[PDB]
């Protein structure tokens, strides 16, 4: 199965429209699932138009042939998650889809950048780590680059009070090599 | 000599046939496992059906629907099932498709009547009605009036498979998706097939028995037999025919004395 | 319905692992679907609970073996590798006897986290990141830890980044925030505490 | 010899010669003198038990499951039989049909949804005479029968073939020659 787009961006009150693309025949039932991060998934639609029990009236899918859509009329602040399409057939008996992530849009902000030198407790150990921090920015993307004279990064999710992100890169160096941070950003 | 009056002699039965228990059933069956009910020893009123305007199809094949209240029948049946609205044209002598090939087959020399009406009010839920099934794959066609119930994976031309769907290991059945916003022709119709054999007879319609008239050229009807003769008294003993392949004796169906038939 | 999972468990590369899925709700299959972290969903197989007839995926022929009794259904996986770290879900499927089922997997269990690593159980190493100030929990096993500030007396500005995996088999996360402040780090699979004062 | 010619139709005839095409026992055929094994039920079974020992019969497929007990009790329930049923150590779900009403010949058939039983008994191996069999009962059940087995209280068996005879009635309307 093949969903499109990969990520989708809206504001609360808009009208979501996303599409799956199934295969061979008419004995090829299709369903839609919703997953929030840290939960188990949840049935929404079965046989491409029939709502499951307890789903409100704003989730309503349609489509026939080899093209299926899910359409949300009014977008609530509780309807931001990941959505899957799932076929049921004979030769591949399930074949889940790939995933489409839904999110909130607000005004483009800019991060307040910090930096941290390695403490002497860590300098005794033999390996030093230098943290470079971002805070509360909304594009999804940024590039943090190290300049001296490798590293790994980790990104938090949407915040439930202002819908921004954060990030922290960490240059890891040995003690002897330490004895011997430009933020690329479109809102700056 | 011209015939003088008419003679009608039917047996003294007074029970009526269970057509209510067939037409007004609460739930019918699916077409791959179709129901059957053999009807005998009653009086059948085929005037309360062709006068009903509810039935959107009333075909009859070996007989006209008006002339049903006059014949006496042997081996009446009834076959109830639920199909989709654009497949009622297949319930006929010699058709092709998926109902007249793997589900329900009528013979070529068929004598009976096919009735089919609309039941969207009873066979359509809100989420859908997914438990009216029909067979979609089978190795070969059916013989006439042959039933086939089996839930086994239809192995096609590949490596075999054992209670498991896979590459060319289809499911045999298929469920109709009856939801009430379908167009007509995708709605649940609801079919009864009456089949009977003509010419021991038990079932026939409400004609009133006259008395007996002897030694006069009359027209008679002894439980099915039409003709024109003179009725006398016999000697030694139904249907009593002789070397000329014609009836010349008949047992009277209400008093067991034997009568003759002499032609006028 | 209500379906229950066994619980999280950590194994060694080459060992075996067995996951259960209780069903306290009295004609339906049981599916097993796995989700690697940051990945899409993926089907493993189904087992009929009564007759015990099973079907497996093409990818998992030879590594997975699902059993049952009479309900409670078991899934067992052997020859573990570095690519079998995921969360495992069991899913109920209403069926029609004879045809393909048009209903989807409506009831899901909550999930069973399986971690396949090589290293040993270890404690963290908090390093005070004074400048915007952050305790750096470093080189522990296994995930999770719990980080709070002022013994749970601060909620605004408190960030905790997700734990990433290093090249020594150990996890490490950061925890920044924007008066004396003290972070408090717990790690339940060995219970150490390191109440580091940050200045 | 010349045993097993029944009345095929329900038509009186007199002083004629008529030719039918039905199932009969062939003239000068080999029957099986038994002294109770399960037996095949191919197309119809001639039966002839010269002798109060021969009670009834069980008719079925797996051993649905027709039963004649001699007040002839006839039940077409779905039964569980023993290894050697005899007389009452003979044996329930979904009972469908029920009914109650020397040389003793019988002819059994199963066609078209009917079950046809013919009978005759005369006072006296099998004798050399010529007998007709008036029909006794006609049972409308329409089931699947492949094997059968007699019962006892602790005979001969033929098989019916498609043939074409030429019967002979008389002044009284009784078959006396073929
Ligand atoms: C048939 O019924 C009528 C009316 O009850 C009666 O007079 C007649 O004797 C009956 N005949 C037989 C053969 O039962
Ligand atoms: C079935 O019921 C309807 C009323 O619900 C009635 O008018 C009709 O005559 C009945 N059909 C029978 C008894 O065959
Ligand atoms: C009767 O039973 C046999 C085996 O039990 C089966 O092969 C045959 O098809 C059955 N007859 C009918 C008409 O189905």
PDB file of N, CA and C in Angstrom, chain C residues 9 23 41-42 45 48 73 75 96 101 106 113 119-120 134 142 146 149 159 165 179 191 197:
ATOM      1  N   UNK C   9      10.348  -7.195  28.831  1.00  0.00           N
ATOM      2  CA  UNK C   9      11.378  -8.171  29.141  1.00  0.00           C
ATOM      3  C   UNK C   9      12.529  -8.029  28.161  1.00  0.00           C
ATOM      4  N   UNK C  23      -7.529 -13.329  26.828  1.00  0.00           N
ATOM      5  CA  UNK C  23      -8.769 -12.812  26.244  1.00  0.00           C
ATOM      6  C   UNK C  23      -9.937 -13.154  27.163  1.00  0.00           C
ATOM      7  N   UNK C  41       3.824  -0.289  10.883  1.00  0.00           N
ATOM      8  CA  UNK C  41       3.374  -1.564  11.409  1.00  0.00           C
ATOM      9  C   UNK C  41       3.736  -2.694  10.453  1.00  0.00           C
ATOM     10  N   UNK C  42       3.655  -3.921  10.960  1.00  0.00           N
ATOM     11  CA  UNK C  42       4.153  -5.081  10.236  1.00  0.00           C
ATOM     12  C   UNK C  42       3.483  -6.338  10.765  1.00  0.00           C
ATOM     13  N   UNK C  45       1.475 -13.033  11.981  1.00  0.00           N
ATOM     14  CA  UNK C  45       0.635 -14.150  11.589  1.00  0.00           C
ATOM     15  C   UNK C  45      -0.669 -14.164  12.358  1.00  0.00           C
ATOM     16  N   UNK C  48      -6.005 -19.456  14.692  1.00  0.00           N
ATOM     17  CA  UNK C  48      -7.355 -19.777  15.132  1.00  0.00           C
ATOM     18  C   UNK C  48      -7.290 -20.305  16.561  1.00  0.00           C
ATOM     19  N   UNK C  73      -3.476 -17.127  24.472  1.00  0.00           N
ATOM     20  CA  UNK C  73      -2.732 -17.451  23.266  1.00  0.00           C
ATOM     21  C   UNK C  73      -1.291 -16.986  23.439  1.00  0.00           C
ATOM     22  N   UNK C  75       2.740 -16.537  21.795  1.00  0.00           N
ATOM     23  CA  UNK C  75       3.577 -16.344  20.622  1.00  0.00           C
ATOM     24  C   UNK C  75       5.016 -16.469  21.081  1.00  0.00           C
ATOM     25  N   UNK C  96     -16.289 -14.402   9.542  1.00  0.00           N
ATOM     26  CA  UNK C  96     -17.423 -15.049   8.902  1.00  0.00           C
ATOM     27  C   UNK C  96     -16.920 -16.389   8.407  1.00  0.00           C
ATOM     28  N   UNK C 101     -13.116 -11.690   5.933  1.00  0.00           N
ATOM     29  CA  UNK C 101     -13.832 -10.930   6.969  1.00  0.00           C
ATOM     30  C   UNK C 101     -13.758  -9.431   6.741  1.00  0.00           C
ATOM     31  N   UNK C 106     -10.465  -4.766  15.525  1.00  0.00           N
ATOM     32  CA  UNK C 106     -11.097  -3.717  16.316  1.00  0.00           C
ATOM     33  C   UNK C 106     -10.577  -3.623  17.745  1.00  0.00           C
ATOM     34  N   UNK C 113       6.924  -4.679  25.241  1.00  0.00           N
ATOM     35  CA  UNK C 113       8.211  -4.175  24.780  1.00  0.00           C
ATOM     36  C   UNK C 113       9.286  -5.243  24.928  1.00  0.00           C
ATOM     37  N   UNK C 119      24.764  -5.781  26.191  1.00  0.00           N
ATOM     38  CA  UNK C 119      25.500  -5.311  27.357  1.00  0.00           C
ATOM     39  C   UNK C 119      24.856  -5.809  28.649  1.00  0.00           C
ATOM     40  N   UNK C 120      25.313  -5.265  29.770  1.00  0.00           N
ATOM     41  CA  UNK C 120      24.899  -5.687  31.097  1.00  0.00           C
ATOM     42  C   UNK C 120      24.145  -4.568  31.800  1.00  0.00           C
ATOM     43  N   UNK C 134      21.336  21.742  32.844  1.00  0.00           N
ATOM     44  CA  UNK C 134      20.860  20.392  32.626  1.00  0.00           C
ATOM     45  C   UNK C 134      21.693  19.228  33.117  1.00  0.00           C
ATOM     46  N   UNK C 142      18.932  -0.823  31.609  1.00  0.00           N
ATOM     47  CA  UNK C 142      18.165  -0.568  30.391  1.00  0.00           C
ATOM     48  C   UNK C 142      17.203   0.602  30.547  1.00  0.00           C
ATOM     49  N   UNK C 146      13.870   8.101  35.142  1.00  0.00           N
ATOM     50  CA  UNK C 146      12.915   9.157  35.473  1.00  0.00           C
ATOM     51  C   UNK C 146      13.682  10.347  36.026  1.00  0.00           C
ATOM     52  N   UNK C 149      12.832  17.748  38.737  1.00  0.00           N
ATOM     53  CA  UNK C 149      13.545  18.908  39.255  1.00  0.00           C
ATOM     54  C   UNK C 149      12.883  19.396  40.535  1.00  0.00           C
ATOM     55  N   UNK C 159      12.183  20.256  30.114  1.00  0.00           N
ATOM     56  CA  UNK C 159      12.267  19.402  28.940  1.00  0.00           C
ATOM     57  C   UNK C 159      13.008  18.122  29.291  1.00  0.00           C
ATOM     58  N   UNK C 165      20.550   5.874  21.342  1.00  0.00           N
ATOM     59  CA  UNK C 165      21.436   4.732  21.512  1.00  0.00           C
ATOM     60  C   UNK C 165      22.823   5.079  20.998  1.00  0.00           C
ATOM     61  N   UNK C 179      18.693  31.021  43.861  1.00  0.00           N
ATOM     62  CA  UNK C 179      17.846  29.844  44.003  1.00  0.00           C
ATOM     63  C   UNK C 179      18.642  28.576  43.699  1.00  0.00           C
ATOM     64  N   UNK C 191      17.357   0.130  40.850  1.00  0.00           N
ATOM     65  CA  UNK C 191      17.155   1.174  41.859  1.00  0.00           C
ATOM     66  C   UNK C 191      18.412   1.906  42.346  1.00  0.00           C
ATOM     67  N   UNK C 197      23.238  18.019  42.823  1.00  0.00           N
ATOM     68  CA  UNK C 197      23.048  19.456  42.946  1.00  0.00           C
ATOM     69  C   UNK C 197      23.728  20.155  41.777  1.00  0.00           C
TER      70      UNK C 197
END
